[PDB]
Ligand binder design. Structure first.
Ligand SMILES: CCCCCCCCCCCCCCCCCC(=O)OC[C@H](COP(=O)(O)OC[C@H](N)C(=O)O)OC(=O)CCCCCCCCCCCCCCCCC
Ligand SMILES: CCCCCCCCCCCCCCCCCC(=O)OC[C@H](COP(=O)([O-])OCC[N+](C)(C)C)OC(=O)CCCCCCCCCCCCCCCCC
Ligand SMILES: CCCCCCCCCCCCCCCCCC(=O)OC[C@H](COP(=O)(O)OCCN)OC(=O)CCCCCCCCCCCCCCCCC
Ligand SMILES: CCCCCCCCCCCCCCCCCC(=O)OC[C@H](COP(=O)(O)OCCN)OC(=O)CCCCCCCCCCCCCCCCC
Ligand SMILES: CCCCCCCCCCCCCCCCCC(=O)OC[C@H](COP(=O)(O)OCCN)OC(=O)CCCCCCCCCCCCCCCCC
Ligand SMILES: CCCCCCCC/C=C\CCCCCCCC(=O)O
Lengths: 691, 568
């Protein structure tokens, strides 16, 4: 086909595994924020311009399609203009210019170098190599027209903040264009174009090796940097902020893509219709890319809200990973025979299932280590993830053994449908358990009968029905396995699950200071109770269920379409695709909720410097201790105030190096804990002072 | 020639250009030392393990010449057993084990992954694809043998602090090996070996792009990270340290490479002599690499004397750059006939000139900003750089202008031949000024400063004799230009010869500057008289032509040394 659909998942896995490595490295404090600044400066100043130089000097302008380029330009400008006029229509008067200068750049700019380039290369390395030219053309040019206007609006916003002196050209457009030229995305392009014209598209050999060495090491490095720059950014936004963020994200990932698709459809007049359709769908894969670091730093320097822009950047990447997957596949979907349609559905389900099962096995291991199965609903949550992993394992075993073997073993691996029914109805079980949580303490419904009813899912009755029901005749897929009665079984069961979820949503609407072991440190029990209460994270379970509900609606709609009328029309194929991505990427969302969730000499100089200077800086005032246990009043202090003290006077840069410093003090015997056994973790827990 | 030496210079321009790009970044403080560790963890913990993981998995062991792998190992071991015993008797007993525990590992480790892989690839990416495997076998096996002997050696140093009673199993070997496995590279070998057999020497597609996407991001990043680890490392230790630096450095740069070439000759028994010759010169080409910063940081975790190693990290990186270049040319010289050798000397002259020009621009600009026109002989030295800038300026005109076109294009060289002679005289009349400085006018010297009697040779280019083949500076018309080449230098040298006696009877630094080039002038003196007596190379006159090239074109490299690292 026009795209390397097989190589979509290897490339997405590459970029997102690297970005996840960055995320975990940032969260594991192996590379703090200040340390990550070094990688950011490297990838900005050195690696990226060399890549542009190498790919721009050899750029052949004689065989480019300016029509498609201008089409993507006019689509991006239309999105910019539409969002700008809507923002100017409705916004805070004191911030309308700020919004109309920052949201359009967020809805038009995208990370087309670090993320877009590997994907488009893996899709077009052998089919349409010219797309590598068009990726390095469209982005820089789009970075010289729209974001200038955005900077202009930023200047209008600052002039609202500063009366200025009638600077129609001194400040309105001066620094507005200046901020465009000083970026390595514009002036470096100018230099590359000048050298491309100077030379005969032949970079000298004596510089080719150096440029290749400095350019081949930018993709992974920039992805890693984005990973370490996606740490501590998903904050809590108000209802207005949340809705504005949703509007912007849906715009950047749906509206602009279809706008580019339609512009390419109507403007292009190429004789080859097949290449025109290929180019149009390529334009559709364009746009769904998440925003670039550029919008985040642009917000940062101007000192606007920033929070909205970076939150949009995180949520755009996270939802752009599956959106790029489904969009590309749906774009390859229109032209193959029905049998390759079914085989491709099986393949994508297998891939999403195996990766989602690796993630879920990690989550299960971390849950078993966490031992959160005490008095929290965590037990039923982790059992549901255990069921999802069973669903994935059934997927893999169904993959390798299908349309062969004997009927017996066939049903032996078709029993994964029982686990899948249990998954649907375990989302409803999560709903009713939250309903009990809203009820008074000691809810009539215990946890044992809840589990018995859950894994006692009537999918066993579905097994009885399939024993009584008709046998499989073709079994080309799990859905059309042994007839249409299973469709009724899935529709009914999932309808009960979604009804239970709706009921739950309605209910939602409805005196020894030195030593503190026994005579003191009785607040350790209170602190561990607080830690367990923080471990009680039913809010993320709520996020889970109300995130699943929409997909459950999708599957029930698909089934009702099939039994309602026997007219697929290729629409039921995409409905099957959405059902498959749900059922076999449940692991991905569960990992998004759990697993990636909360809950020698150098030490000597660290401790000496501290105890000699920072101790003198009112260490009694800093170590704020209140009613230490039941004997002393001033024995132990919270670490949050400690990290605040480090990051408020300039002792430590941020909380990462500060927590590392506290670890150093722990290893140096200068700071202690309430029980003297635990280790410093920068939390409300009270901490002793070991002298 | 199996080694594509034409690609040797571009490879060297990449490995040392990037670290210089990092080094200048560290100097500018754009990426400070504290912020450097962010890149350091990426290469060490992520980029390096993925790079090893991918290749090892696809690595085939049946098609491996184990003789070459053994040869370097016992060559790395032979140096290992030699240096330790020398330091175990002559060094102070307070730290004999430390000097026999980290110096012998400082003289056998190398930057195989950072500075080594691109260079070995650039010369054998097509001719000898197998040579890109032993780079990933010789080094990791070296992490298997020698570093444990060195690690346990540091334990007796700790045993000096904490005597206890012969804690052999406790710390001497209880921590010596722990310093091995914990190192990220070495553990990756076992995992790569394990997966080499679990899978049929293939990497799963689902992470193949993950590894390749992360593996390729090591070469550029590792070279860059070396730059920020080099700023503020060279210190003053001339009391008694410098002398031992050349002993450790020449062990890795001279002693170790010599055996590797020799022992592989008596070990490898391949039928193809040419292949064995490639394996011989590859054994030499291995070991000239600069020592890896793992040794530089190994001392940091062992908190012992670091200065000798961290300075050994910076100097070995610089000194490795020419040796890897000049030496590799020498082995290739006997193989080729004198037609490409005449092109090779032309190519090597064109190569050294480019890098030297960067120093000349650096030095001639800093003196202008520092106002070195002062009455001291400094203002003379500036004109040396202006004269020396033209020296390499015409060297590029060799390739894309000369050897073709017209004699008029050849005649643009007369400025560079006068400039080539100008430096010969300019260092000469520079002595006249210092002659007056040590005796109790400059105006007389100034009027002769730009007089350039080489312009009197200008008539010799027009009327002395019609142009000959004209492929090189000395290769122009007959030997009359070499007759005049003979006259220009010895006159300058004979004035310098009586200044040292006159003295017996940074102004002082310029005296050292003349002495450094006076050896090349003596070398050129021999170069200017050998052909006159007889035009027979004899395998020796060729190597002084190569010594002539590194003197004539590329003499500003030392010149920047006097005027570099001072910074007002
Ligand atoms: C014949 C020799 C063969 C090769 C041998 C090796 C050659 C060594 C020399 C190579 C150049 C090294 C320069 C070292 C000095 C430091 C450079 C440096 O870091 O400056 C910085 C610039 C990067 O642009 P910026 O506008 O500042 O970035 C702003 C951005 N928003 C940010 O803050 O993050 O950084 C730069 O961009 C400067 C270039 C750094 C190298 C990276 C690739 C450049 C490719 C493009 C070359 C043409 C354009 C040059 C523009 C110069 C800009 C200063
Ligand atoms: C059959 C056998 C065939 C063998 C063929 C071999 C051909 C190639 C031979 C090349 C010899 C290389 C010698 C390197 C010098 C060893 C000591 C050292 O590290 O010095 C660096 C010295 C001493 O190191 P240092 O560490 O004391 O000084 C550092 C000083 N600061 C901190 C200010 C930088 O460093 C220098 O000052 C110079 C650095 C560049 C050196 C470049 C080469 C100079 C010329 C060497 C001799 C080669 C030409 C004469 C022909 C001889 C042929 C054998
Ligand atoms: C029709 C749906 C189809 C599905 C795809 C989505 C298409 C959406 C098309 C309609 C867009 C809605 C426009 C109006 C949204 C509501 C704006 C609003 O209420 O403005 C004020 C509100 C809060 O204001 P306040 O609390 O005072 O300040 C908070 C500052 N952070 O918020 C603000 O602070 C205002 C921020 C700037 C103004 C935002 C609204 C204008 C821009 C809308 C862009 C929509 C993007 C969709 C793409 C299609 C084309 C627009
Ligand atoms: C598609 C294939 C996917 C394969 C996934 C499974 C990979 C592991 C098993 C297969 C082997 C391949 C990797 C082998 C090299 C491992 C190198 C290593 O040491 O990694 C472990 C690392 C360091 O810690 P460690 O050395 O364990 O600590 C000392 C031990 N006493 O790390 C640690 O153990 C530290 C503690 C954990 C920190 C990282 C966990 C954060 C969350 C990661 C979740 C994702 C992991 C799976 C990827 C799929 C995600 C969709
Ligand atoms: C009773 C002993 C009898 C003699 C036995 C050993 C003979 C050979 C010794 C090595 C050969 C080189 C000669 C020694 C040069 C040492 C450097 C020097 O000139 O400084 C003298 C200084 C003496 O002071 P010391 O008490 O050692 O401690 C100094 C504190 N830094 O010394 C030092 O600073 C010592 C520095 C550490 C040790 C350096 C020597 C080992 C490393 C270089 C090995 C070179 C290998 C060459 C292989 C060639 C093979 C063909
Ligand atoms: C004569 C050598 C020919 C080969 C040239 C190799 C290219 C690299 C050469 C040397 C780089 C010099 C690095 C800058 C020196 C100052 C840094 C410092 O002293 O710390």
């Amino acid at each position: 086909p026009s795209m390397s659909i097989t190589r979509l998942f290897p490339a997405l896995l590459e970029c997102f595994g690297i970005v996840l490595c960055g995320y975990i490295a940032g969260r594991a404090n192996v590379i703090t924020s200040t340390q990550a600044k070094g990688l950011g400066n490297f990838v900005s100043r050195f690696a990226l311009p060399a890549l542009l130089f190498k790919n721009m000097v050899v750029l052949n302008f004689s065989n480019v399609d300016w029509s498609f380029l201008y089409s993507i330009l006019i689509a991006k400008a239309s999105v910019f203009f539409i969002v700008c006029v809507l923002t100017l229509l409705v916004a805070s008067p004191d911030s309308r210019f700020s919004k109309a200068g920052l949201f359009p750049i967020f809805a038009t700019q995208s990370n087309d170098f670090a993320l877009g380039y590997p994907i488009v290369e893996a899709l077009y390395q052998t089919t349409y190599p010219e797309y590598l030219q068009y990726i390095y053309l469209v982005a820089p040019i789009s970075l010289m027209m729209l974001n200038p206007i955005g900077f202009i609006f930023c200047e209008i916003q600052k002039w609202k903040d500063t009366q200025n002196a009638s600077q129609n050209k001194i400040k309105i457009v001066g620094l507005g264009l200046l901020r465009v030229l000083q970026n390595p995305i514009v002036f470096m392009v100018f230099i590359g174009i000048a050298f491309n014209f100077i030379l005969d598209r032949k970079v000298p050999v004596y510089v080719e090796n150096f440029l290749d060495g400095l350019g081949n090491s930018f993709s992974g490095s920039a992805l890693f940097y984005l990973g370490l720059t996606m740490v501590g950014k998903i904050k809590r936004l108000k209802k207005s902020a949340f809705v504005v963020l949703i509007l912007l994200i849906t715009a950047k990932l749906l509206v602009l893509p279809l706008l580019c698709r339609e512009m390419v459809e109507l403007l292009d007049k190429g004789d080859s219709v097949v290449n025109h359709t290929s180019l149009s769908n390529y334009a559709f894969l364009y746009g769904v890319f998440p925003v670039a670091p550029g919008v985040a730093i642009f917000a940062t320097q101007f000192n606007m809200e920033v929070e909205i822009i970076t939150s949009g950047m995180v949520i755009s990447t996270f939802v752009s990973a599956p959106i790029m997957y489904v969009s590309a596949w749906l774009l390859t979907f229109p032209t193959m025979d029905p049998k390759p349609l079914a085989y491709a559905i099986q393949n994508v389900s297998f891939d999403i299932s195996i990766v989602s099962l690796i993630s879920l096995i990690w989550s299960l291991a971390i849950l078993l280590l966490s031992k959160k199965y005490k008095q929290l609903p965590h037990m039923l949550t982790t059992n549901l993830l255990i069921a999802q992993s069973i669903v994935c394992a059934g997927m893999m075993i169904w993959n390798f053994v299908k349309e062969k073997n004997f009927v017996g073993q066939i049903l032996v691996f078709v029993l994964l449908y029982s686990s899948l029914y249990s998954t649907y109805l375990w989302t409803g079980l999560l709903a009713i358990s939250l309903f009990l949580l809203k009820k008074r303490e000691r809810v009539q419904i215990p946890v044992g009968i809840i589990i018995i009813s859950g894994w006692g899912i009537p999918a066993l009755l579905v097994g009885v029905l399939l024993i009584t029901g008709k046998h499989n005749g073709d079994s080309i897929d799990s859905a059309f396995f042994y007839g249409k009665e299973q469709m009724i079984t899935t529709a009914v069961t999932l309808f009960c699950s979604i009804l239970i979820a709706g009921i739950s949503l309605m209910c939602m609407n409805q005196h020894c200071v030195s030593r503190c072991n026994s005579q003191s440190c009785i607040l350790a029990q209170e602190e561990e109770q607080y830690l367990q209460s923080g471990d009680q994270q039913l809010t993320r379970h709520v996020l889970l269920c109300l995130l699943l509900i929409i997909g459950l609606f999708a599957n029930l709609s698909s089934c009702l379409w099939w039994l309602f009328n026997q007219e697929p029309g290729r629409l039921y194929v995409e409905l099957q695709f959405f059902c498959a991505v749900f059922n076999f990427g449940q692991g991905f969302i569960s990992f998004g909720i759990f697993g990636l969730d909360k809950h020698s000499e150098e030490i000597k100089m660290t401790c000496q410097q501290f105890i000699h200077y920072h101790r003198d800086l009112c260490i009694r005032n800093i170590v704020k201790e209140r009613r230490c246990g039941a004997k002393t009043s001033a024995g132990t202090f919270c670490g949050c105030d400690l990290v605040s003290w480090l990051i408020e006077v300039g002792l430590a840069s941020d909380r990462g190096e500060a927590v590392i410093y506290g670890d150093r003090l722990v290893q140096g015997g200068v700071i202690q804990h309430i029980t003297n056994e635990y280790e410093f973790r920068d939390e409300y827990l009270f901490y002793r002072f070991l002298q």
